[PDB]
With several copies, the nearest count.
Chain A
Amino acid sequence: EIQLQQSGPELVKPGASVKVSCKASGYSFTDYNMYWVKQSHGKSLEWIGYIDPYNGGTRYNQKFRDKATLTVDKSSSTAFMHLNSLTSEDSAVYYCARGYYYGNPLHFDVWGAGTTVTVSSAKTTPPSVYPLAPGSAAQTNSMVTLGCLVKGYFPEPVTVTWNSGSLSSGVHTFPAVLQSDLYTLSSSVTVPSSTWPSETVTCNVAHPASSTKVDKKIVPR
């Protein structure tokens, strides 16, 4: 099918450059144009520029005339976006999209997975994981909420499954909050009192940046 693949997240030291890529498939890479967009806060959407694969000519937004640099490689059916002098103001999620002009003002029919770029001098630190067990055991209502606490890691992207993903229903993983170059996540799960003490529950964690993947048996006390 028609799909635009990109690169994964990039932790880049401040003031450095970065060269993300966006590959295409299904359609003819060269007949359509490739546009690039930025999203700060996960709220505001901003266009940077675009490039005609066949001609290779670029067109930039004034704000990013020299911040951004676009290149392509037809052999790999791939387009790239190059950035320089990265500041905190330059850290966001970056998308790539397809288009074709047929007289009416252009729109965007396909979007890439989005590449989240993070600028920070902070080091890559693996997370610290701590379980959460119902403390007093003081209310055996038929549904016992359990937890899992992830603390102290950088960059932000970390994933949390329960029993290796089997437990998909009734879970809640909260957005992390940064404090002193360290992200702090939590997750919870709600299950019946008649299952957990018998059914060995566990919590699955990952931090690909530091290449850290660990589980945690949850036990009562």
Chain B
Amino acid sequence: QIVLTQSPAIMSASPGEKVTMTCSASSSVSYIHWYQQKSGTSPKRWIYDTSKLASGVPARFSGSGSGTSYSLTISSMEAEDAATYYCQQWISYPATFGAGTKLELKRADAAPTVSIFPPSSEQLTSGGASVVCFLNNFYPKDINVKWKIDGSERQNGVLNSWTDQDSKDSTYSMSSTLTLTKDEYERHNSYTCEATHKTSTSPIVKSFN
């Protein structure tokens, strides 16, 4: 019944920057609780009773709020602080949560390590032919990939997959698998993977024949 709107939906932060995320409500709440969740993990109790910190939480975290606008703040961003943070309330049944506020880390912009690979004999043995292109350890997240064939194009098979902030370098990665029929594969010779970035006056591209 109570709608909790957290903004921004996503948020970047450089180590040391003051971070502040909101959870705007439709009505008032006395107490609130904040939970941290990282990729592939269960939520963790982060801030119980509005401002009390849980067992094993640094002091840079101090979440407050009053009425309908409760917010979480951090004095100094750090690597382990990067995670998704949700707001929760149980003043009124039912219990509701916010949309979620993801917290990323800011790295110097980096260039992707582009790799491309042809199909496998074992796959061609099965009548199928796939071509993969790997775009590892880049920043920021926004990038576009296009595929070409002998100066042509084909969006019938483009399947892209993304990663999240790397635990070690806070970089990203992507996969494009291009699936094709055994016949249409050899029908062409030159196969290419295109990538458009920001620190990339020259679009980075890799191919073969």
Interface residues of A in 128-152 (CB under 8 A from B): 128, 130-136, 138-139, 143, 145, 147, 149, 151
- Assembled-state Cα–Cα distance A177/B128 (Å): 18
Of A44, A131, A175, the contact of B120 (CB 8 Å cutoff): A131
Interface residues in B148-174 by Cβ distance below 8 A to A read: 159-163, 173-174
- The answer to the question of A108 belonging to the interface, with a C-beta cut-off of 8 Å to chain B, is yes
The yes or no answer to A186 lying at the interface (CB within 8 A) is yes
Interface size on A, residues (CB 8 A): 45
Smallest distance from the beta carbon of A161 to chain B beta carbons, Å?
15
Nearest chain B residue, comparing its CB with the CB of A188: B134
Contact B116 A44 (CB under 8 A): no
> How many A-B pairs with Cβ below 8 Å?
125
Which stretch (B12-20, B39-47, B66-74) binds chain A?
B39-47
Chain B interface, DSSP helix/strand/loop, else mixed: strand
Q: Is B7 an interface residue (CB 8 A)?
A: no
Interface centre among A45, A61, A62 (most CB of B within 10 A): A45
Known: A145-B134, A174-B173, A184-B177. A45 touches B97 (CB 8 A): yes
CB of B209 within 8 Å of the partner chain: yes
| Whole-angstrom distance between the Cβ of A107 and the nearest chain B Cβ | 4
What is the total number of residues of chain B having a CB less than 8 Å from a CB of chain A? Answer: 50
Contacts of B93 on A, CB cut-off 8 Å? Answer: 61
Binds A, one of B27-35, B57-65, B75-83, B103-111: B27-35
Q: Please give me the 8 A-B residue pairs with the lowest Cβ-Cβ distance, nearest first.
A: A132-B117, A145-B115, A107-B33, A130-B120, A111-B42, A105-B90, A45-B97, A174-B161
